[PDB]
Design a protein around this ligand. Structure first.
Ligand SMILES: [Zn+2]
Lengths: 207, 112, 122, 56, 123
RNA sequence: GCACCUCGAUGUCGGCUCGUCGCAUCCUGGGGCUGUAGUCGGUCCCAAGGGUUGGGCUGUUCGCCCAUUAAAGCGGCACGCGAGCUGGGUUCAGAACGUCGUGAGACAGUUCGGUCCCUAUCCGUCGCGGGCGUUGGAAAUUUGAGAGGAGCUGUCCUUAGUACGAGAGGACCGGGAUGGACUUACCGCUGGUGUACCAGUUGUUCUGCCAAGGGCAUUGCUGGGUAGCUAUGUAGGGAAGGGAUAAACGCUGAAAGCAUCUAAGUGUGAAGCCCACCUCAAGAUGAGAUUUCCCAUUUCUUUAAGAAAGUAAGACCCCUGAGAGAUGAUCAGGUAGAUAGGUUGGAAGUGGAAGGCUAGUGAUAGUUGGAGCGGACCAAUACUAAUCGGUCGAGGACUUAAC
RNA sequence: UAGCGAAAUUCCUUGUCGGGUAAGUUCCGACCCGCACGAAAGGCGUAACGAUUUGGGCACUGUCUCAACGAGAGACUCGG
RNA sequence: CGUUAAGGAACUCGGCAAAAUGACCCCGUAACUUCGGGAGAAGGGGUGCUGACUUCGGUCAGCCGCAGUGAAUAGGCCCAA
RNA sequence: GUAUGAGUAGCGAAAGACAGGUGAGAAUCCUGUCCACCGUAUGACUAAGGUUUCCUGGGGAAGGCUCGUCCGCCCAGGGU
RNA sequence: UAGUGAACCAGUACCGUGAGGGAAAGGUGAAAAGCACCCCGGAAGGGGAGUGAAAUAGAUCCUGAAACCGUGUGCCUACAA
């Protein structure tokens, strides 16, 4: 239901009111413009478009500025949706500010990972080595392709092929502060993402 | 750096004295057995600093009953009452890791 | 980070000095152990007299690792040896004296007859 | 290993559809109309930015 | 950075190239060497501005110790030694300029290797 | 056992890496009986979802032994896998012992040492691009036909010293706390690396000399170390539920005036099946859906779904680049500019620069001063470099019904 | 005969007892039912010597638990 | 080719390969024996710069660094068969 | 004689950079400067062996594992 | 590719210390009348103009097949084992 996108800044520490150290990430936000309302009568499901930043006017198109123009804002970059929300309560062109997650405290964080190029068959899957001495020649290889009888190779025998670039949720994290005047949520733990990327933040599914 | 130093100015302690690595220091740390709160004491030698702002740290070495004991601390805890600079030292290094292999009448530091 | 075929020391008056580990009890393939864990172990070197002699299957508990534990404050303890104290599975030592400082994290594990014998409980 | 068979006449000309050469970025000058590469000093003109650079 | 060679050979190269542009003020080389020479020449002329130091006693690393650049006589054959030219000519030319003392142009590929080439000037 | 099969040449069993399948089930899950008081057990039925340890002695298939664990399953895949590895042992040429042979020599008797080649063409598998189609031309947001992942479990407290027992001992069903193994993501902490960062120091050489500095000696060696990448570090994960079932247990009820879970009708019922959790997904040629943008010259070929040409919306070529990267792609920008380099400030990080003064006969010490130096990190600034330009790109077929 | 003896020789065999190890069919010490040791195709001891074969300790360590980072050449892109 | 936390033969047929010792001066040195040896047995200590004293040889005082044959070259040892 | 493999593997241990020359044409030839390597040898003198490779002036069809105005290569003259 | 191994400067070139072994390679037209002169190009090479009955007989020179490599086009091909 509750949902705010945003950026990724870095890592900090916070003493809580009992005095314990806690590792803390930093997520920003902005004003938060609702773009369309999708109904069953026209689209067969129910959702809400949402998008967070301000492009310059040089960097968009006449279709984008026609699509934004029923909310009277600048053209915005990161347009996404949100499902599973009971609507009411949502006009075209509102602002879903940082106020929503004051005591939410259980949150799914869905970033997108880094990227690491081609890498070996170990670093994807943790397959162990072979021996580095006693005469061998089998230091860092991906194993054997299977048995002999089927005259082929089965599928999902994992080999080399680029690390990272796919999107990963993490379930059931806590919220520490909500700083409305500076547009910052603080989260315990670790968010998948490079800096300046997107991060979606939702109220968690598993209660 | 810009928002981080904004968001963490409430919790930076300001009343911490100035000490260089190589200075003997007491630590009036707090010991929490749940309800009870008593105050232990170190008297060691300061070896580390790690400049980071919010989360700098430092180490202290006793020599208690023949066995060396080393304990780090972050600076900005509410669970440290005071820090008492006691002595000073002629030291030309920044991190004094060479003290582990020494004993007694050889791990001495000079005084200023 | 103490494993199989790793040599501790004895901090008792129980006639043993240096011990090899055998296993890392509790679990089904646990690799390492930290302060407050239980070892099956056997005495290598010994002293004349004393109760415990060489070649005995002997349980012990780690005091003073060289990579001690995080506390929830934020401090870390790091000693300069390894040590063990031979235990009757009553959680009660065999000797009547313990040498050297002893880290506090035995109190979570209820070795309350050992901690009241240490010179300094750190 | 070792090739199993002769590859036919067709698979040559089905591999070699990506063994092409291409020219990129030919523009007219501002001073002679001669097709010379963009973001590059015009060789016969000597006239980058409308300024003669190759000067002694 | 840009790796080109082993470690000490890059230091040899970037001392060799950047004492030209101090004697000749024009160089024809490739792309990558030109961008490293951007960085190093603009780091050395700002030692050219001070005149202490320490301006002398830091410029005695990235400048070849003596390479004469003599077009001068009063009644002698007096010598400008490729560092004295920094602390006499190139220093006070840029008393009002901030950073950015170099231009790079894009001429032709070389005949033998098709390596694309570059002229570096100052102004 | 037989000799169809491979002699113009198909390597032996263990071990390493990597798995996969069957169920005659080793643990966990659900049941029936008991010569089942309780705690334990014995046997049989359903059930393949996950898991199944480190060592010591043998070349070892076998095995025996130590210590653990919920448990340390049985088999197939050329007794799995040498164009992936080991070459250990058995099966080359040397030599020796026991036994046999008159003798050259021999022994599934034994002991030491012994040359294992291959630059992937096709299918296969893992990743990534080009073209076309998707029936006017484009920019974005999605539904899910299908498919993959994940599926484990211990210990303690309380109900309770209760039920059961003469005692000895000692629960089912519930609630809570906390670990092992595995696994997703990240660098604030603990640590590692960090060869264009800082300092010390030996030899010799060079910048004329003293002072100050470069070159070479594995980066000369030694002590620290930023970003980036990292685990043994940090945080999280398997929760809770729904529907139809298996073995088993019934309710009602006759065939067969009783009985009886079954033929008519109606239920309970497992880590298993289908959902629920995460990911991919319209080349799903059955090519889906919504929002927004753009509206007409010449030739007649004979007007047909004709050709040819300049455009609109928009994309590309080229250039500065990294949060991306084998190349191509992706993403940030291109003077309506902070895209990179420099400049001015800082920060991490070394630990007190050069010059000069004082104290010392000297090596050296103090002070001018937390000084000097400062790769990737943080802000401000158009000074230098992305100017000039060019290429591609629609005018919207037919039938029928409803209006 | 002396002298040795589960041996470079022993099928049964991992003979039996002692030592060494948490655990030792390999090693060392002893016994004798030597399948089938034995006196110049020499028997039994032996200091020094051995790029000889076998068993065990100290010190040291990426061989290992379990991997991580950096440098150079090849691999990749463009020209011959 | 260079470096590594904690552990230090758990790898393996086998410590194969790497790591560790290595220069000069001084103290000290076993069983056994063919009396020559073993023996560099094992195990330890010192090294830089300045001043004075000194016949010779070194001593005494002082100074600095984590480390003073500061780089390169230069034996791992013991117990049994 | 010509294909396929395929415009793939390889291009046979080592440090170069710039300015000015000549020329139809230059990273590869000439000259200048700085840097770097060996230095019980990559320095000097001779015995075998080779048999004109020596010097001067021209040339770029083939050889040189690329290019080449250059060469121990081709042409002409000449030296013990 | 026959006929001597050798129709051509063949027991030669080349291979082995040596005894020995041992190749491939014929054809312009009748007559060299073998392309003066002009243009591109450093040259090679080519296009005109000529000699010639013929130059698609231009010196690798009568005729000139096949594999192999190219250019242009009438028909077909992007849900197919
Ligand atoms: Zn022009």
């Amino acid at each position: 239901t509750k949902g705010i996108l945003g950026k990724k800044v870095g890592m900090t520490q916070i003493f809580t009111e009992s005095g314990e150290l806690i590792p803390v990430t930093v997520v920003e936000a902005t004003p938060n413009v609702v773009l369309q309302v999708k109904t069953v009568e026209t689209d067969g499901y129910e959702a809400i478009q949402v998008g967070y930043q301000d492009k310059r006017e040089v960097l968009s198109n006449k279709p984008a500025k026609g699509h934004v123009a029923k909310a009277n804002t600048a053209p915005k970059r990161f347009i996404k949706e949100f499902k599973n929300v009971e609507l009411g309560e949502y006009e075209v062109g509102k602002e879903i500010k940082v106020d929503v997650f004051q005591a939410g405290d259980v949150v799914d964080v869905t970033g997108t990972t880094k990227g690491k190029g081609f890498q070996g068959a170990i670093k994807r899957h943790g397959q162990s080595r072979g021996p580095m001495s006693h005469g061998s020649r089998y230091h860092r290889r991906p194993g054997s392709m299977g048995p002999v009888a089927p005259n082929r190779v089965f599928k999902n025998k994992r080999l080399a092929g680029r690390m990272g670039g796919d999107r990963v949720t993490i379930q059931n994290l806590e919220v520490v502060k909500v700083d409305v005047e500076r547009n910052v949520i603080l989260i315990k733990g670790n968010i998948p993402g490079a800096k300046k990327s997107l991060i979606t933040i939702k109220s968690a599914v598993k209660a | 750096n810009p928002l981080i130093q904004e968001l963490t100015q409430e919790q930076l302690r300001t009343d911490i004295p100035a000490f260089r690595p190589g200075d003997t220091v007491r630590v009036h740390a707090k010991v929490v057995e749940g309800t009870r709160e008593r105050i232990q004491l170190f008297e060691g030698v300061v070896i580390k600093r790690r400049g980071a702002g919010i989360s700098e740290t430092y180490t202290v070495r006793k020599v208690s009953n023949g066995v060396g004991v080393e304990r780090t601390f972050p600076l900005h805890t509410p669970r440290v009452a005071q820090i008492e600079v006691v002595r000073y030292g002629k030291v030309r290094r920044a991190k004094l890791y060479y003290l582990r292999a020494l004993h007694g009448k050889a791990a001495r530091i000079k005084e200023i | 980070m103490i494993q199989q075929e790793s040599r501790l020391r004895v901090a008792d008056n129980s006639g043993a000095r240096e011990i090899l580990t055998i296993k890392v009890l509790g679990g089904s393939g646990r690799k390492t152990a930290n302060i407050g864990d239980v070892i099956v172990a056997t005495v290598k070197q010994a002293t004349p007299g004393g109760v415990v002699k060489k070649g005995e299957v002997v349980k012990a508990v780690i005091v003073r690792t060289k990579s001690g534990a995080r506390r929830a404050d934020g401090s870390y303890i790091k000693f300069d040896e390894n040590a063990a104290v031979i235990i009757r599975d009553d959680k009660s030592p065999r000797g009547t004296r313990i040498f050297g400082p002893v880290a506090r994290e035995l109190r979570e594990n209820n070795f309350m007859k050992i901690v009241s014998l240490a010179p300094e409980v750190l | 290993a070792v090739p199993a068979r002769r590859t036919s006449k067709a698979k040559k000309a089905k591999r070699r559809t990506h063994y092409k050469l291409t020219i990129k970025g030919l523009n007219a000058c501002s001073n002679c109309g001669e097709m010379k590469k963009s973001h590059h000093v015009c060789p016969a003109c000597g006239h980058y930015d409308g300024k003669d650079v190759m000067s002694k | 950075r840009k790796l080109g060679r082993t470690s000490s050979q890059r230091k040899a190269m970037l001392r060799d190239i950047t004492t030209d542009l101090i004697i000749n003020e024009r160089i024809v080389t490739t792309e990558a060497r030109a961008k490293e020479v951007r960085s190093t020449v603009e780091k050395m002329i700002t030692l050219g501005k001070r005149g202490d130091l320490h301006a002398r006693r830091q410029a005695a690393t990235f400048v070849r110790n003596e390479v004469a650049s003599v077009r001068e006589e009063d009644e002698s054959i007096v010598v400008e030694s490729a560092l004295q030219k920094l602390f006499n000519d190139l220093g006070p030319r840029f008393a009002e300029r901030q950073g950015g003392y170099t231009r790079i142009l894009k001429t032709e590929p070389r005949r033998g290797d098709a390596a694309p080439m570059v002229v570096i000037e100052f102004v």
